[PDB]
Amino acid sequence: HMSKAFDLVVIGAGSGGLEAGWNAATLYGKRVAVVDVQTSHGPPFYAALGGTCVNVGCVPKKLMVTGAQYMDHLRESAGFGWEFDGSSVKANWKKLIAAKNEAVLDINKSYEGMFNDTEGLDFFLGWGSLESKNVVVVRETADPKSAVKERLQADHILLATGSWPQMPAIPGIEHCISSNEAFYLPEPPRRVLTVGGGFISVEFAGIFNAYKPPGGKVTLCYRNNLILRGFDETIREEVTKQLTANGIEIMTNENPAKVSLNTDGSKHVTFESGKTLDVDVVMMAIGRIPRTNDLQLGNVGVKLTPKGGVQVDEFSRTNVPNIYAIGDITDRLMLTPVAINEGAALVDTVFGNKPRKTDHTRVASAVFSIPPIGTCGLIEEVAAKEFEKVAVYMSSFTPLMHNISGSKYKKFVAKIVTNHSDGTVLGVHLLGDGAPEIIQAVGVCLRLNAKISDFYNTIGVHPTSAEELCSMRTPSYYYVKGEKMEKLPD
Amino acid sequence: HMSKAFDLVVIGAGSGGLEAGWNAATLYGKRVAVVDVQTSHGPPFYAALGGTCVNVGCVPKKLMVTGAQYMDHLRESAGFGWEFDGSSVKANWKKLIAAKNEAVLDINKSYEGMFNDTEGLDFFLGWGSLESKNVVVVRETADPKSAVKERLQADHILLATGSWPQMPAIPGIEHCISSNEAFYLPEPPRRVLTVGGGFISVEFAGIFNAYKPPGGKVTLCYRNNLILRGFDETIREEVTKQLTANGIEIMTNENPAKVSLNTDGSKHVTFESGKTLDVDVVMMAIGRIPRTNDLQLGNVGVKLTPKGGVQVDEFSRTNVPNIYAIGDITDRLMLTPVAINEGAALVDTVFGNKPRKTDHTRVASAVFSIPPIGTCGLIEEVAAKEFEKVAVYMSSFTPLMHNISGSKYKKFVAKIVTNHSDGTVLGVHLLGDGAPEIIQAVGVCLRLNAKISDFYNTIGVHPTSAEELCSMRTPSYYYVKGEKMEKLP
Ligand SMILES: Cc1cc2nc3c(=O)[nH]c(=O)nc-3n(C[C@H](O)[C@H](O)[C@H](O)COP(=O)(O)OP(=O)(O)OC[C@H]3O[C@@H](n4cnc5c(N)ncnc54)[C@H](O)[C@@H]3O)c2cc1C
Ligand SMILES: Cc1cc2nc3c(=O)[nH]c(=O)nc-3n(C[C@H](O)[C@H](O)[C@H](O)COP(=O)(O)OP(=O)(O)OC[C@H]3O[C@@H](n4cnc5c(N)ncnc54)[C@H](O)[C@@H]3O)c2cc1C
Ligand SMILES: CN(CCCN1CN(c2ccccc2)C2(CCN(CC[C@@H]3CC[C@H]4C[C@@H]3C4(C)C)CC2)C1=O)CC1(O)CCN(C(=N)N)CC1
Numbered sequence: 004h005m006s007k008a009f010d011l012v013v014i015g016a017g018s019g020g021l022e023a024g025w026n027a028a029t030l031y032g033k034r035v036a037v038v039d040v041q042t043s044h045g046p047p048f049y050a051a052l053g054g055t056c057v058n059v060g061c062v063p064k065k066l067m068v069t070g071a072q073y074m075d076h077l078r079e080s081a082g083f084g085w086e087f088d089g090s091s092v093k094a095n096w097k098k099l100i101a102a103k104n105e106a107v108l109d110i111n112k113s114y115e116g117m118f119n120d121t122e123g124l125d126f127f128l129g130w131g132s133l134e135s136k137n138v139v140v141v142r143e144t145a146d147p148k149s150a151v152k153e154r155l156q157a158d159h160i161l162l163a164t165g166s167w168p169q170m171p172a173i174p175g176i177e178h179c180i181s182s183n184e185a186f187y188l189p190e191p192p193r194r195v196l197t198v199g200g201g202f203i204s205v206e207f208a209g210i211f212n213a214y215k216p217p218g219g220k221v222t223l224c225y226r227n228n229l230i231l232r233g234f235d236e237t238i239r240e241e242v243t244k245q246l247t248a249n250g251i252e253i254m255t256n257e258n259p260a261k262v263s264l265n266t267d268g269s270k271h272v273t274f275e276s277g278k279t280l281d282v283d284v285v286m287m288a289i290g291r292i293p294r295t296n297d298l299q300l301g302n303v304g305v306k307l308t309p310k311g312g313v314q315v316d317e318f319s320r321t322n323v324p325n326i327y328a329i330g331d332i333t334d335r336l337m338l339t340p341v342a343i344n345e346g347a348a349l350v351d352t353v354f355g356n357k358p359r360k361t362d363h364t365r366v367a368s369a370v371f372s373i374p375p376i377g378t379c380g381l382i383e384e385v386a387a388k389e390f391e392k393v394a395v396y397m398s399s400f401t402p403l404m405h406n407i408s409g410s411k412y413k414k415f416v417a418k419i420v421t422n423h424s425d426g427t428v429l430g431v432h433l434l435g436d437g438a439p440e441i442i443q444a445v446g447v448c449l450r451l452n453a454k455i456s457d458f459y460n461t462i463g464v465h466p467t468s469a470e471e472l473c474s475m476r477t478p479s480y481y482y483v484k485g486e487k488m489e490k491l492p493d
Numbered sequence: 494h495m496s497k498a499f500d501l502v503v504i505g506a507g508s509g510g511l512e513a514g515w516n517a518a519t520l521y522g523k524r525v526a527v528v529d530v531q532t533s534h535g536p537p538f539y540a541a542l543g544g545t546c547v548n549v550g551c552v553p554k555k556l557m558v559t560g561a562q563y564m565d566h567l568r569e570s571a572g573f574g575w576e577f578d579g580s581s582v583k584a585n586w587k588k589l590i591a592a593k594n595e596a597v598l599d600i601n602k603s604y605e606g607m608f609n610d611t612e613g614l615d616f617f618l619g620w621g622s623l624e625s626k627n628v629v630v631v632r633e634t635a636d637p638k639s640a641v642k643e644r645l646q647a648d649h650i651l652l653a654t655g656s657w658p659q660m661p662a663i664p665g666i667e668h669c670i671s672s673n674e675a676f677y678l679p680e681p682p683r684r685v686l687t688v689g690g691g692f693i694s695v696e697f698a699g700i701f702n703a704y705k706p707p708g709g710k711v712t713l714c715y716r717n718n719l720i721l722r723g724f725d726e727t728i729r730e731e732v733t734k735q736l737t738a739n740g741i742e743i744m745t746n747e748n749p750a751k752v753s754l755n756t757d758g759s760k761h762v763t764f765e766s767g768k769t770l771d772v773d774v775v776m777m778a779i780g781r782i783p784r785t786n787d788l789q790l791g792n793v794g795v796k797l798t799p800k801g802g803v804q805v806d807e808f809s810r811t812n813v814p815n816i817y818a819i820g821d822i823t824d825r826l827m828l829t830p831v832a833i834n835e836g837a838a839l840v841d842t843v844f845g846n847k848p849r850k851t852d853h854t855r856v857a858s859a860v861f862s863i864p865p866i867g868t869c870g871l872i873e874e875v876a877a878k879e880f881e882k883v884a885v886y887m888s889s890f891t892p893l894m895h896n897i898s899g900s901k902y903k904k905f906v907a908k909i910v911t912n913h914s915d916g917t918v919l920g921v922h923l924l925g926d927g928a929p930e931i932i933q934a935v936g937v938c939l940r941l942n943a944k945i946s947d948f949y950n951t952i953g954v955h956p957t958s959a960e961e962l963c964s965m966r967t968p969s970y971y972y973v974k975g976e977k978m979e980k981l982p
């Protein structure tokens with residue numbers, strides 16, 4: 004049962020856990036154990052070796068959004084002279100899912116090869132939990148009464164089990180799915196309700212909108228007034244219009260009260276307001292919660308936050324000295340590259356003895372909505388509270404290609420938020436094609452404390468959308484002590 | 494004929510000339526005249542109000558490349574489950590050209606509105622030339638014996654007439670076209686030869702490749718071993734492979750010696766080697782030369798360089814005090830945003846009395862090839878001569894989508910060149926989808942003297958191609974005193 008001492012035992016072979024494990028083994032020559040619940044994607048556990056991103060997150064959803072974008076490309080090609088039989092166009096969901104599955108499986112297999120070929124980096128199949136401060140027990144199932152496969156003696160323990168979809172406690176919740184199941188639907192739904200205002204709901208609404216069979220309809224509902232809270236307000240409003248223009252129904256200030264089955268097997272959703280909707284799939288995407296319930300954290304007294312995340316300091320330390328937590332389990336920025344950076348920083352701190360912490364400010368991120376979002380740093384509302392004088396530079400225009408394409412609704416939006424006292428760029432927010440690619444090097448600019456003048460004195464690359472960031476010299480409006488106004492008082 | 498004094502007379506209403514004119518009129522309250530040969534795009538002189546970029550350059554080119562990209566999208570859609578009758582797919586070139594024409598004409602019309610609505614900004618139709626230091630004459634044609642339309646008295650003169658396609662002196666050059674005429678072909682050529690290894694040749698090869706009718710073939714020829722001289726060598730090699738994979742024939746070490754007309758109107762090209770090729774169109778894209786012949790610069794003695802550009806200092810000043818030159822006529826970086834920047838800087842210097850100059854280093858640019866290129870700063874061969882220790886960081890990978898799409902040849906290439914003594918990024922070179930958009934903010938990073946660690950300590954955006962720029966920690970190889978090697982001593 005008991006193992007030889009590992010320097011590090013990682014529970015969860017995902018984005019953060021694999022970076023920590025790999026770095027500890029290869030950069031510092033340490034003996035590392037990594038635990039996960041299966042070696043390949045999909046039911047019943049969905050996540051697997053590689054993590055949520057590889058298996059049921061960033062990687063497959065990006066492939067599926069790319070697939071969905073072809074609906075727009077096929078239509079838009081006509082404006083540039085492409086002609087074909089429109090009545091022959093069919094979207095084969097089964098083919099998409101099969102191709103996605105092969106791609107994810109290849110990644111699963113490549114991670115299996117990493118463990119085989121790397122000395123001092125060992126994989127253990129099963130469910131990890133804390134028996135004591137220096138013992139991780141690996142059992143056959145999530146049930147703590149299931150059979151022990153081994154006990155891993157651990158000098159250090161890393162909790163990196165990620166998050167899991169939140170499901171509301173409403174009648175007929177068992178008739179709904181999450182993003183996990185959406186990845187394995189045997190057929191594309193004719194009618195679908197995506198529940199939530201966040202990026203997962205918005206992204207899947209776009210995917211379903213493109214692959215739906217004839218006479219179909221995608222509806223997104225959100226309990227508050229405006230989707231995508233935490234993103235730039237102009238972009239939130241503008242994405243809503245552009246989703247609507249592509250046939251997606253957006254129900255704001257609406258929330259399901261119950262779901263029941265119609266006699267034909269479809270789902271009848273009743274909302275709190277009294278509204279109803281019949282759909283084939285109800286996909287819940289209202290949040291993700293830290294995955295702590297199976298770790299038996301009470302055995303060692305690892306503290307959780309009020310919201311349920313493992314409580315950590317800036318260096319990923321729990322209240323128990325040799326036990327650390329990174330990634331989505333900490334309930335902060337649920338992004339793969341953040342988990343990776345936290346894992347790397349942790350290993351440098353613990354095994355390199357040079358403390359390093361992840362900077363959670365000015366992190367660039369994206370929403371692969373159609374059209375997509377790219378963002379880095381503060382929205383103007385948040386900046387207006389932290390700084391006395393804030394300037395907002397805004398450009399909004401339909402690119403010339405979309406006059407020709409017939410998608411006149413596709414406005415590109417670029418916004419730069421600054422501290423007007425010294426011109427320091429506090430945030431950049433982009434909506435439109437290429438936005439996720441444009442924003443990466445903007446992340447590097449914000450790390451370097453770029454000012455607005457560093458942007459407008461840089462020579463543009465023409466013709467691009469990106470050059471709009473270097474063409475904004477004069478603020479569109481300001482915030483003075485929190486108060487919006489077009490001009491500054493003298 | 495002789496006007497009242499203008500503060501500035503601009504010859505050429507293009508990228509640089511319009512920026513200068515607008516800024517001088519609106520920011521400094523000056524009285525400005527701008528001269529161009531046409532009010533809208535197309536034959537006989539092609540460029541017009543708006544410049545080369547608007548009329549027969551960046552703007553229409555980009556729309557046409559966007560059109561061409563749909564051949565790849567339609568094909569690649571099948572990998573993601575899209576099904577349709579492939580046998581019904583046709584590319585209507587006439588429809589592309591008509592849409593392009595409307596878009597460009599709208600821009601021409603908006604520029605007419607600018608002149609109508611702006612006090613002290615006046616447009617004059619005709620051919621500008623220098624009569625004397627303080628007089629620009631506007632004539633009916635480029636012939637200096639043609640009729641005078643008016644004489645413009647000028648306190649300052651800006652030469653901003655751009656450039657023009659270079660045509661080799663071969664027998665049957667009259668049977669060839671340039672990029673100018675390519676924009677107005679009534680039908681897409683079944684067979685086309687694009688002559689030259691530069692960006693225009695490569696871009697048009699991609700355009701013609703997508704719109705060619707059945708049984709078609711695009712051939713690109715270049716007189717030396719490898720296309721795209723001046724770009725990163727890895728990218729030059731890789732883009733050659735990717736063009737070939739999309740069906741374009743690349744003829745290196747070949748150059749046309751003559752062209753004759755076949756009896757069906759097609760062209761018979763004979764190369765210097767003795768090889769021959771029959772094509773429907775021969776597009777010369779061997780270079781662009783400064784447009785100085787019609788300005789009568791000998792009347793005032795404005796100095797040209799040995800290459801033929803108007804000689805200028807770093808502030809765009811000629812050898813004659815009140816006469817300046819910006820844009821492609823200076824024969825340096827032939828890019829629209831550089832011409833614009835030069836025009837703004839000139840006006841601040843002359844009318845603001847606060848001297849400003851354009852920085853011609855670390856300028857980001859793109860090639861809208863399929864796949865496209867984005868680049869900023871130095872290639873490693875140039876860096877290795879100027880710096881003692883240079884590191885090259887390189888990543889080349891086929892993106893995951895392109896396993897599914899069936900275009901496995903579409904490798905993304907990311908290269909960072911640094912001064913290894915302090916880690917300062919000297920250049921960044923990208924090949925693959927998104928490269929032109931990725932490289933813009935990289936331009937800003939280089940202005941801020943970004944080091945390699947500023948890239949690899951920035952958190953990635955995932956999944957993107959761009960995040961490869963933040964994932965390269967260890968050099969792939971070095972140059973030490975100009976000598977390539979895998980490891981340092
Ligand atoms: C639909 C969707 C789309 C997303 N898109 C993006 C995107 O575009 N960009 C982006 O940056 N982020 C995206 N994310 C977020 C990203 O997936 C996460 O932030 C990231 O995966 C978190 O990494 P981690 O190391 O915290 O945990 P994960 O990568 O989730 O790994 C946790 C692993 O632990 C395993 N595990 C759980 N419990 C146990 C146990 N008791 N014993 C052993 N193993 C266990 C799981 O099987 C899993 O493989 C997306 C998420 C979802 C759901
Ligand atoms: C096919 C092609 C594609 C290109 N693509 C790009 C790109 O993607 N990105 C990029 O940055 N650059 C591109 N360029 C380069 C860009 O177009 C030029 O750098 C830019 O237009 C130069 O601006 P300018 O002010 O020097 O002159 P121009 O914009 O060329 O303007 C010169 C004007 O002067 C007029 N003129 C000439 N002689 C006289 C006279 N005697 N009297 C009156 N008027 C006169 C012409 O009609 C013309 O309108 C491209 C060029 C070509 C040919
Ligand atoms: C009677 N035939 C004739 C063909 C008519 N069809 C069938 N069809 C279809 C699509 C998927 C599964 C089964 C049938 C389509 C539906 C609508 N079009 C939409 C094409 C869109 C419209 C604009 C842009 C996006 C895409 C572009 C043409 C590129 C595709 C073909 C269509 O127009 C078809 C059916 O038998 C198939 C079954 N039908 C159904 N379930 N409603 C319709 C009748």
Ligand SMILES: CN(CCCN1CN(c2ccccc2)C2(CCN(CC[C@@H]3CC[C@H]4C[C@@H]3C4(C)C)CC2)C1=O)CC1(O)CCN(C(=N)N)CC1
Pocket residue numbers: 021022025056057062110113114116117120893
């Ligand atoms: C960020 N990585 C840490 C992860 C380490 N490894 C090592 N490794 C490996 C595989 C076989 C033998 C030896 C080592 C891999 C390399 C490739 N990965 C696949 C990564 C995919 C690519 C696309 C998406 C899914 C996952 C994402 C990058 C998230 C599997 C395992 C891997 O990810 C740093 C690396 O330098 C590790 C070493 N690398 C390499 N040997 N090619 C490249 C990347």
Ligand SMILES: CN(CCCN1CN(c2ccccc2)C2(CCN(CC[C@@H]3CC[C@H]4C[C@@H]3C4(C)C)CC2)C1=O)CC1(O)CCN(C(=N)N)CC1
Pocket residue numbers: 564567568579580581582583584706707
């Ligand atoms: C179905 N018929 C007529 C359609 C054949 N055509 C005509 N045609 C065409 C294209 C432009 C103008 C005039 C006629 C094409 C030839 C070229 N292909 C292009 C294939 C594209 C290339 C990129 C993407 C779209 C499709 C993909 C590979 C999916 C479609 C249209 C095509 O496949 C075919 C036959 O008559 C010809 C072959 N047959 C025979 N030798 N006995 C019998 C059947």
Ligand SMILES: CN(CCCN1CN(c2ccccc2)C2(CCN(CC[C@@H]3CC[C@H]4C[C@@H]3C4(C)C)CC2)C1=O)CC1(O)CCN(C(=N)N)CC1
Pocket residue numbers: 511512515546547552600603604606607608610
């Ligand atoms: C520094 N200037 C350079 C030249 C100024 N003007 C002023 N102007 C104008 C037009 C009518 C009445 C008064 C002033 C224009 C506005 C935009 N242009 C249209 C040209 C488009 C804009 C961008 C690309 C597509 C085409 C390109 C210039 C190639 C016409 C002339 C213009 O370009 C830039 C702007 O003034 C241009 C106008 N701007 C805008 N509408 N948002 C941004 C600032």
